Amino acid sequence: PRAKTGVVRRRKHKKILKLAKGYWGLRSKSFRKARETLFAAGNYAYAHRKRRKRDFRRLWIVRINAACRQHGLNYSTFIHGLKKAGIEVDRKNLADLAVREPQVFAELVERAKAAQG
Amino acid sequence: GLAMAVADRAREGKLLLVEAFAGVNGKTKEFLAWAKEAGLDGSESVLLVTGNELVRRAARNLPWVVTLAPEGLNVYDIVRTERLVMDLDAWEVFQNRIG
Amino acid sequence: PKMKTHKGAKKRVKITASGKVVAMKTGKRHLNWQKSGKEIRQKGRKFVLAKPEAERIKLLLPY
Amino acid sequence: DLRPNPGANKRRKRVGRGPGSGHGKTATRGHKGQKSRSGGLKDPRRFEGGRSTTLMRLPKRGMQGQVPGEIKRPRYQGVNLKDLARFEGEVTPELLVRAGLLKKGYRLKILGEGEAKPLKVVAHAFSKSALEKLKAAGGEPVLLEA
RNA sequence: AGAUGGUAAGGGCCCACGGUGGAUGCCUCGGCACCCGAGCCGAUGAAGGACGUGGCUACCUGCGAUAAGCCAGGGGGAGCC
RNA sequence: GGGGAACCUGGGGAACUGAAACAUCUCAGUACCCAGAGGAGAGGAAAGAGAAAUCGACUCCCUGAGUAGCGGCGAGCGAA
RNA sequence: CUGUUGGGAAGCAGCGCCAGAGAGGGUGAAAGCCCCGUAGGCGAAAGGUGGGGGGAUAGGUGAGGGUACCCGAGUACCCCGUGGUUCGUGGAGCCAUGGGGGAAUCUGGGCGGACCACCGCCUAAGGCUAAGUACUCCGGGUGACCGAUAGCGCACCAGUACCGUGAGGGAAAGGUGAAAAGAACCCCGGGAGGGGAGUGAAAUAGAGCCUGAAACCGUGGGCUUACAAGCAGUCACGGCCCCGCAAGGGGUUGUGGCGUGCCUAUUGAAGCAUGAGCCGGCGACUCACGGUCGUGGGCGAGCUUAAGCCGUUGAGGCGG
RNA sequence: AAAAGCUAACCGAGCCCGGAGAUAGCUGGUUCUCCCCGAAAUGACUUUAGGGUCAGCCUCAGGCGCUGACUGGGGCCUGU
RNA sequence: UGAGGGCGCGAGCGAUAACGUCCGCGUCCGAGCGCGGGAACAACCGAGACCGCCAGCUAAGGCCCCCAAGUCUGGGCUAA
RNA sequence: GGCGGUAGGGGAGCGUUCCCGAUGCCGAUGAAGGCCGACCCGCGAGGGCGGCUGGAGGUAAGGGAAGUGCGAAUGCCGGC
RNA sequence: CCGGUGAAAUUGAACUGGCCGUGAAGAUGCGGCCUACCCGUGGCAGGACGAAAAGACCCCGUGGAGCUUUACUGCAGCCU
RNA sequence: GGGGGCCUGACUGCGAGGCCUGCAAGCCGAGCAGGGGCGAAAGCCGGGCCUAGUGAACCGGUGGUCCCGUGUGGAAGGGC
Ligand SMILES: [Mg+2]
Ligand SMILES: [Mg+2]
Ligand SMILES: [Mg+2]
Ligand SMILES: [Mg+2]
Ligand SMILES: [Mg+2]
Ligand SMILES: [Mg+2]
Ligand SMILES: [Mg+2]
Ligand SMILES: [Mg+2]
Ligand SMILES: [Mg+2]
Ligand SMILES: [Mg+2]
Ligand SMILES: [Mg+2]
Ligand SMILES: [Mg+2]
Ligand SMILES: [Mg+2]
Ligand SMILES: [Mg+2]
Ligand SMILES: [Mg+2]
Ligand SMILES: [Mg+2]
Ligand SMILES: [Mg+2]
Ligand SMILES: [Mg+2]
Ligand SMILES: [Mg+2]
C-alpha cells in the first residue's frame, strides 16, 4: 500500500499564494517566500489591531485639546472638571462634537470651569 | 463467537433449519422454486449451509446466496449475509462444537 | 530475538517473591586483615536496593 | 447485527505515534533533542557511564555450574490441600496433573492449610506438621520407593 | 504672489491570453513477492556468440549454405508468405 | 573435460564492527577464492544415545530452551 | 430483442432466458445471455514421466551340540601440538588427527565427562541406500504489491547509448485517436512553419499528438511611480478602476502610525555563525522475536497452544 | 641516480566489485492541525569533560486527603 | 536536562581594572527577540499577551515641536 | 477560577494509498485531476457550492492496514 | 560603437545612501541627524567581513593513516 | 593526661533505631543468649579521645564444613 504525495503538497502552496496576493515580486509567487511574509503579517496585524485604538486614542485627544484651547483652557484642565462632574460618558471619540454641532460641546466646557475655580 | 451470531439471526428470526428439498439434485431451477415455496423472494441476502454438494450447484451461481460447507461457519459470511439457512447435517457438528 | 538472560546477573542476584531484588552484601574477601568484627556480620547477609533493581529485573525475565 | 456497524468498543484504537509533523509531535521526533541519538545509547540496563556498572556485587550464590551441567534428580513439588477438597477418593498424582497441579514436575508431596476431608491421598511424601493434621481423618499410603 | 494638476522612458501590483516545461489524475505488452509444479544441458559438441540468409531489407525476430527454412504424423479449418 | 539464477558437500578463509579504548573473545568458519555433486545436496543402519536390568539407521519442523552450560565469567556465545 | 439520449451503449426503460457457467478480459462508454472464455465434460499417432497398480528377475529363507579357525592395522590405545561439540586448559572426557611409541580376534575392543572397581550400552579403522529438507533461470495460480522520479537497472532495441585501456560503472525515454479516416487541394514562403478547406464526436486530440500545475518568458488591459531613504509588510483614511440592491464588495496605493527576513546550533541575535537561486516530484521511527506498563475483550484454579493432520479454495476443525 | 617521486590527469600505499546500510559519543535534515501542563544547563560517579548511568526539576493514570509552601507564637541549633 | 547567561548583593582571584573568571542568595533572558519608558539596546523600569471591539482606570516613565499630556501654581538656585 | 511558552508529557482531530462494506451505489444529463471565487460549514489541519477545462473512473456512514502530510539536509532527478 | 552567434562561478529575497551612537557591541537594513529627480554607459576598486577547497593556523574525537622504538602482544625468518 | 595490678571484649550468634547519601558504601548504636575478663558491688568490656592511615567486583592459595559431587561406590572439582 503505497501512498505517494500527489494532491496534498500542491494545494497548500496555492493557499499561501492565495494570501500572498499583491506581494512584491517573488514574495507572492515563490512559495517558501510567501510562507515568510505571511508570518510577519499575522504578527504585524496582531500588534496593530491592539494598536489601532492607541492611534485613535491619541488622535481624539489632540482634537479635544484643539477644542479646549479654543475656549481658552488646556486639555488637562478640561478633563478634570468633567471628571469632577463625574461623567463617565465622554468616550474620547464622542468628544468629536467640534464639527458635530459645537454648542453641544462648547457648553460642555463651561460645565468644567465650575468645579475647580 | 460462533454461537453469538447464530442466535443473532434467531433473536431476529432470520433463521431456518431445513431437511426437505425439492432440490436434492443438481439444478439452479430446482431450488429457486424451493425458495419460492419456502420464503426467499430475492429481497435480502442469504447464507446457505448443507452437506449436499448438489444444492450448492443449484445456487452456486446465485448472486444473493453464497455457498458454505457445514464446517467453516465463518462469522464473516454469517454477519455478511442478511439471513441464514442451515441443515441438520450441520446441526450435528454445530452441536458437536457446542450443543 | 528471544531475549537472552544475563548469566552474569543470575549468578549474582536472586529474584524474590514480591518482585524485589536481593543480592549478597559486598566487601568480605579482601579487606579482612582484621577490621571491625562488627563489619564481618552485616556483610555476610543479603540486602535489597531501590531503583537499580528494575535495571536488573529486565536483564532476567524468563527467570 | 448486519455486516457493518460492528465497531469496536472505546479506548482501544491505535492511533500510534507519528512524530513527523510541524506542531503535532516535535521536529526532533519525540524522545530526542540533545545529541548522541540516532543509533542507540548502548544498553541502559547493565551498562552506561563507563564507571563500573553495578556488577560490583558479589555472586556467592554458588554451585554456578560444572561441565555436564545439570543432573537428573526428580523435582519434589508440593501441593496445598486447600482445594484438595474440590474432589475426593483415592487421589493420585496420575490425576493431580489432570486437575491442574504438578504438571509432570512429578514426585508429589502434600502439605498446606485447612480442613481435610478424610480423603485418602496417595503421594510421594507428606509434611509432618500436616500428617497428623491428616491423622485425624483417614489413611495415607506412601509412594513406591526410590 | 500663492495653490493645484499634469508626461512614463521603464518599473511595481493585479485580470486576461499564450510559449517552454513537464508534476498531479487515469491506463499498463512491465516488474515485485507467496504457494504449487518442475528441475539439468553438452564430445550426436553445450550455454553464449560471429557472419550470413529475404525479390527490394536498416534493425528486431526466426533460421543455417537445404538458411524468415525441409520431411512424416497429430490438432484445427480460411485464409497465408 | 565446459556451462548452469540461487540451493548442497568438502579444501582454504579474513578484517571493519562489538567489547562505548583494545590484544583472549565477537563479527564467524559469515562474506570471498577453489574443487565437485543434481535436481536436489550432505548424512544415514550404532564401537549411538542416556539411566529405565530403557529408546532403536538418517534427515526435517515444534517444544525442551535462551534450560543446562561457555565466557579478559566482559561483551556476549550457545547445546543435547 | 426492441425503444431512447448519445459519435459510439454494455448506460436508461420494458418484456424475457440460461443456469454445475453471476470469475475475467475485449467490443466507440458500465454486457451473466455480441466475442474469447469460466461451471462441468472428452481428449494424442509420438516423446517423456512415473511417485499408484501389475509381471518378471536380482537377491533372501532351520535348529542343537563340538571344534579352537575368522571377524576390516602403523589401526586401536598412550603422549606432544590441534579442531569440532555451548568446553577460551578448565576437574576436561568424547569425536577427527599432524608427529612419536605401538595391540589383540569375543579368554577379544570402544563407551557411560579425569582415574579405578562393579554395573549397563555399543562391536569401530569398507562402502552404498529412495522418501521426508533447501532454491527458483523456468511454467501456472495468487496479492488490503508498485504504477513511468514507483515497481529489478530496462514496461520502450538495455546491460543499449555514454564514461573507462581495463575490469567495471550505467542512465533518460510510455500514452493522438476506437478507427490514420493523418490533412487532397489552394495561398505566403527557399524550405521549415503557418492561414483556409476538408476527415474526425472533438484538431481548443496535429504526429514527443491523454491530462496540463509551478518555476521562467512575452502581448493586451485597470491602479501607480521621475522630492525620495526602503525584510518590501500591517493598520487608518482618502483617491482610481471595476462588481454589486440599500448598504456593501474586489483590485491598486498617496499620505500618516508601527515594523531588525526563515530554519539550525547557539546563553546570545537583525547580523560579520550553518544552510538554501526558484519551482515541481523521491526522501526520513515501520517490521520480526522476546519483555515491562497501560488498556479492550475470552475463560476463570485454571488459561493456552506450536509444528503438523481432514476440506471449499480468501471456510474452519482437530492437534495438550 | 632517492622527492616518498611514479605505478593511466590529486599515491605516505592504484582502480573496480564485493563484506556493506562497516563505525561515528560529530554536522545537518526529521514533513499536518488544535487543547491542557510544562522544566533543566544542579549534585555524585565516569580514560570523564560535546557524551553516559542515579538522584533532582517535568507530564500522565490510579491510591492518598490538610500535610503543603508562606506567616504568627513556643522551644532549640548557629559563631560571619 | 545535566555547556547556560544577565543584574542587584557577600566574598576569592585580578591591579579595591577588565561588557574578565570561580562561588552563595534572589531575580529575570533562555522558554517572554510578544507590549510600553530607557532615541536605538535579550534579561534596567513596568507589566504574564486565549481571541475581538475606533470603550474606560493605570505602573514605569513623561506633559514646548517630531511626541499623546500644564510653556500649571507657589518658593529658592545657576550665567556656564 | 485558569488558558505566553522551547526541550518533553497526555488528549483530540483533518488529509493521502489500499481492504470489508460491493454481483452496492454515483458517473456520458461528464468521474478522478487541473484553473478560478468576494459563497457556506470548521477556531483548525480540512469538508461542501457556482463557473471553466478534462474525458472514465470514483466510492458514503461504521471497522481495518499503511511506503502516509515537507521549507531547507552546500538533500537527489528534471526544468527554468 | 554597429551586424551575427552567445556561457560562467554567484545568488533567501530587495525599493541596497552618508554620519554619529547602540547592538554578541565591524549596520544600506536599529535610533537621531544630513544628503539624494528616474534610468543607463565608460572606467577605479574602499565596502557588501565578499565565492570558498569544509583556512595553508590552533584545539577536540576513548577518528584514521605513514614513520620510530630497549611501549605491548604475536608472526615470518634465524639459531637451537 | 601520667604510674601499678589483673586480663584478651582487636569475642561468637544476632541486632531495634538512626546520621550522611543518587547507587555502592561509610558511621553510631542501646537490647538478648553462649562464654569470659576486671571490680567487694553499682557497673564497664563488640579496640585505641575523635576526625585520615584505604580498594567494588573477576581470578587464584591456605584451614575447616551436616553440603553438591553426573549409572553406583570412592576419588577429581565445585559450594558455604
Ligand atoms: Mg485613553
Ligand atoms: Mg469639539
Ligand atoms: Mg504518519
Ligand atoms: Mg510544543
Ligand atoms: Mg548520534
Ligand atoms: Mg553504571
Ligand atoms: Mg502440609
Ligand atoms: Mg532448467
Ligand atoms: Mg437528442
Ligand atoms: Mg524506470
Ligand atoms: Mg537515475
Ligand atoms: Mg518543493
Ligand atoms: Mg611505496
Ligand atoms: Mg523603547
Ligand atoms: Mg488574563
Ligand atoms: Mg502636545
Ligand atoms: Mg485513486
Ligand atoms: Mg548593497
Ligand atoms: Mg600512531
UniProtKB/Swiss-Prot annotation, chain A:
PROSITE patterns found in the cross-reference section: RIBOSOMAL_L20
Any Gene Ontology CC annotation: ribonucleoprotein complex
Entry annotated with the keyword Iron-sulfur: no
The keyword NADP is annotated on this UniProt entry: no
UniProt record, GO biological process: ribosomal large subunit assembly; translation
CDD domains reported in the protein's UniProt record: Ribosomal_L20
InterPro entries, A to Z: Ribosomal_bL20, RIBOSOMAL_L20_CS, Ribosomal_protein_bL20_C
Listed Gene3D superfamilies: 6.10.160.10, Ribosomal protein L20
Similarity-based family: Belongs to the bacterial ribosomal protein bL20 family.
Protein's UniProt name: Large ribosomal subunit protein bL20
Organism whose genome encodes this protein: Thermus thermophilus (strain ATCC BAA-163 / DSM 7039 / HB27)
Curated annotation (Swiss-Prot), chain B:
GO molecular function, one term: rRNA binding
GO biological process, one term: translation
Signal peptide range in chain numbering: none
Keyword terms, alphabetized: Ribonucleoprotein, Ribosomal protein, RNA-binding, rRNA-binding
GO cellular component, as recorded: ribonucleoprotein complex; ribosome
Keyword Ribosomal protein: yes
Record flagged with keyword rRNA-binding: yes
Membrane-spanning parts: none
Function: One of the primary rRNA binding proteins, this protein initially binds near the 5'-end of the 23S rRNA. It is important during the early stages of 50S assembly. It makes multiple contacts with different domains of the 23S rRNA in the assembled 50S subunit and ribosome. Forms part of the polypeptide exit tunnel.
The family this protein is said to belong to: Belongs to the universal ribosomal protein uL4 family.
Record note on quaternary structure: Part of the 50S ribosomal subunit.
Protein name: Large ribosomal subunit protein uL4
UniProtKB/Swiss-Prot annotation, chain C:
UniProt-listed GO biological process terms: translation
Gene Ontology terms, MF aspect: structural constituent of ribosome
Gene3D superfamilies linked to this entry: 4.10.410.60
GO cellular component terms listed in the entry, alphabetical order: cytosolic large ribosomal subunit
UniProt entry tagged with the keyword Ribonucleoprotein: yes
Alphabetical keyword list: Ribonucleoprotein, Ribosomal protein
Alphabetical list of Pfam families matching this protein: Ribosomal_L35p
Record-stated family: Belongs to the bacterial ribosomal protein bL35 family.
Protein name (Swiss-Prot/TrEMBL): Large ribosomal subunit protein bL35
From Swiss-Prot, chain D:
Location of region: Disordered: 1-56
Family matches, as Pfam families: Ribosomal_L27A
GO biological process, alphabetically ordered: translation
Biased composition (Basic and acidic residues): 40-49
Signal peptide: none
Biased composition (Basic residues): 26-35
Keywords attached to this entry: Ribonucleoprotein, Ribosomal protein, RNA-binding, rRNA-binding
Domain of life: Bacteria
Molecular function GO labels: rRNA binding; structural constituent of ribosome
GO cellular component, one term: cytosolic large ribosomal subunit
InterPro entries: Ribosomal_uL15 (IPR030878), Ribosomal_uL15/eL18 (IPR021131), Ribosomal_uL15/eL18_sf (IPR036227), Ribosomal_uL15_bac-type (IPR005749), Ribosomal_uL15_CS (IPR001196)
Functional description taken from the UniProt entry: Binds to the 23S rRNA.
Subunit-level organization: Part of the 50S ribosomal subunit.
Family: Belongs to the universal ribosomal protein uL15 family.
Protein name (database record): Large ribosomal subunit protein uL15
Gene that encodes it: rplO
